[PDB]
Amino acid sequence: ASMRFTTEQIDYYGKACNASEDDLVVVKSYKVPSTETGKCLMKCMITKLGLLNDDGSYNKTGMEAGLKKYWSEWSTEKIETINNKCYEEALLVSKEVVATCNYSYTVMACLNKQLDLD
């Protein structure tokens, strides 16, 4: 189990963020675009899902709700376990760090790591 989005999810949320075609192709290949806004597509996407607040910080309640909505095959216990761990790490991260486009990938990595610990 990982946090990867499906092709279709990427297409839909990518287009909701007005992705350029070239960037979109890259994101669908699970790589990070090198363009100024392409590298921020993941941030834009997960923010529309409510996983992050608008300042970029981790949204605890919004992460829980989004996990339940989009990964409903995971039990609420498993959702809460990985949420509780990642949230606590996110309390250590300042305003200037959460503002970076890379922070979204750091959050997804935390989740993926907690998923592998099962």
Author numbering: 1 to 118
What's the publication's text?
The two OBPs also have some unique structural features which are different from other classical OBPs. There is a significant groove in the surface of the aphid OBP3s (indicated by an arrow in Fig. 2) formed primarily from the N-terminal region of the chains and parts of helices α1 and α2.
However, the interface seen in MvicOBP3 is not recapitulated with NribOBP3. Instead the three chains in NribOBP3 are in a filament generated by an approximate three fold screw axis perpendicular to the crystallographic three-fold screw (Angles 117.9, 122.4 and 119.8 degrees and translations of 28.9–29.3 Å summing to the a and b axis length). This contact involves some of the same residues as the symmetric putative protein interface contact in MvicOBP3 (Arg4, Phe5, Thr7 and Tyr30), but buries a much smaller area (average 608 Å2) and would not form a closed dimer assembly. NribOBP3 has a Ki value of 5.2 μM for Eβf, 20.2 μM for (−)-α-pinene and 30.7 μM for β-pinene. In contrast NribOBP3 binds to Eβf with a lower affinity than does MvicOBP3 and has even lower affinity to the pinenes, which is consistent with the fact that N. ribisnigri does not use pinenes as its alarm signal. On the other hand, for NribOBP3/Eβf, the Eβf interacts more weakly with Tyr30, Arg4, Tyr105 and Ala109 with fewer contacts and has only one direct interaction with the aromatic ring of Tyr105.
